[PDB]
Structure 1
């Protein structure tokens, strides 16, 4: 069933892709590999084609390659990036070395947007509604994005939004230090390693994004981890003894308790002019104790979204088996798992 491939030197590496993809032009590179824009003549879509870099370099790398593929093959939702295609030029596992992933080319992310208009309240409603719709789906599969931020949200011209990327297992300590948007949207329990985290970290991020859509300004633009914590605690208040019990590290608790206690601030006085219902939702998202945060399913039924809420058009995901995340396998074994997922790919009927 193999299409014909053709070769092209492109960025700095030789790209070998099926002839259906035409007019490749590099758009970005990095550590993960390299991306090219192309025209998929078989579907009429503008697509991003990513050539993985060093996919089976190490056991960690090989497992991360498999995780990304499993994750992308699974996502089938209007507000989440899906996989249009995945291919390798190799004809057998023995000659398998390269993986190419094909997705929708997305132009504008939420960043490009908060920076060229004061979103109307109805714009903010619709954007956050879609994020939570995608998050309800993602979380129903027990997937945690872990890295929600404006740059991870694609928004076309009709204001339709897609969640992109997913935190695979990247984030170096250096990329998280200082005055960087890579840390401004992260829940404090993840930020400071307080406890075992769960899907409620993503709702914290949504609260930060929503606040920024409403004000046009970063909610918690800390200059470092500790500065950012003080900004957080000044808004939401210092922890009480109940949340302190749940912080696993004696040292984090010990530092926490060094701080002068502070009451939670009045959000109506912080978000001046905002829809009282937006303020209300923000108060339920931006709760220090993650156990007490609103969930995505609960937030969709919040009155702030009455315009868009449709309980019969907020689907959940098929089961997603992540047992592989606990397996220790050799490089060759992850690679073979990945090859099986490549050759079993079924294009979307879309």
Structure 2
């Protein structure tokens, strides 16, 4: 009861979400089970500016997170907005910084997609929905080629491919590889980026469900991302490498010249806030 609800925010799988002012602090919050009670454990553990804060939780349960004004899917979907190189850079920086933190804490998100990359009123992006997240101990369109094949030994490359997919959608403003089966998703990856050889991939055929695909050459990235410079083409190139050992980590992505080159990232206050 330490909170009292103000506005309905949504329905879904896990309970309903409700906007509230916390009685004591006057701060505004949002208020949400083995598949959820490991999520409750995991999120009260962590603290990062770019990770959703689980503030309280208390079986019929309600889980107080930060309140978030919007998400990247809204921003992507919104025609009233133009994204500038500096908005994109700021968005990918916060995404990757939040990710780097999780992966140094030996956690995979496994459900990166733009509707999970929430934003506050002060332009701070926070990764949300750790219901698929697991310790090292996603929907088709952000899913890595290896996962579509059938790899269960898999790593950070799973989350890194999705970041490429989200990055492309920041640029094109449309899903990059929008497949309508798990095979159509491989068909789409291999016509756009080219069919990987086993020189593009050392132990590929050892996958239980590796399959002999049509040998496409792919579209060059400069044709797809025409407005991107060589520094951002290298970021996109790194994220989309088929070998999950070659594929760039959040850390290698963040030490990439792209984030140190001009134009720099937009401050949160000046990131494009939408209306409903």
Question: How big is each residue's C-alpha offset from its partner over 1:171-207, in whole Å with a ceiling of 9 and x where there is no partner?
Answer: xxxxx8xxxxx32111122233234211211010000
From the CA coordinates, give the structure whose radius of gyration is larger.
1
Deviates more, 1:66-75 or 1:130-139: 66-75
Contact kept, 8 Å, 1:146 with 1:202, in 2: the verdict is: yes
User: Structure 1 residue 69 and structure 2 residue 40: aligned?
Assistant: yes
Contact kept, 8 Å, 1:207 with 1:282, in 2: the verdict is: yes
What residue ranges of structure 1 are gaps of 5+ in the alignment?
Answer: 1-17, 56-61, 88-96, 170-175, 177-181, 309-350
Q: Give the SS at the match of 1:206.
A: helix
2-structure distance, mates of 1:66, 1:166: 11
The alignment covers a number of residue pairs equal to 256
Alignment partner for residue 152 of structure 1, among 108, 113, 116? 116
Structure 1 partner of 2:128: 164
Deviates more, 1:271-280 or 1:296-305: 271-280
Deviates more, 1:30-39 or 1:213-222: 30-39
Structure 2 partner of 1:324: none
Contact kept, 8 Å, 2:143 with 2:161, in 1: the verdict is: yes
1-structure distance, mates of 2:207, 2:220: 30
Q: Give the SS at the match of 1:291.
A: coil
Q: Give the SS at the match of 2:223.
A: helix
Structure 1 partner of 2:18: 36
Output the aligned Cα RMSD: 2.1
1-structure distance, mates of 2:5, 2:62: 16
Structure 2 partner of 1:98: 60
2-structure distance, mates of 1:133, 1:23: 32
Contact kept, 8 Å, 1:121 with 1:275, in 2: the verdict is: no
1-structure distance, mates of 2:5, 2:36: 26
User: Equivalences for 1:184-223 in 2 at 5 Å?
Assistant: 184-223=141-180
Distance 1:292 1:241, change over 3 A: same
Structure 2 partner of 1:228: 185
Q: TM-score, normalised by structure 1?
A: 0.68
Alignment partner for residue 292 of structure 1, among 246, 253, 273? 246
User: Structure 1 residue 27 and structure 2 residue 9: aligned?
Assistant: yes
2-structure distance, mates of 1:154, 1:104: 10
1-structure distance, mates of 2:76, 2:178: 15
Deviates more, 1:187-196 or 1:227-236: 187-196
2-structure distance, mates of 1:157, 1:280: 32
User: Equivalences for 1:5-24 in 2 at 5 Å?
Assistant: 18=1, 20-24=2-6
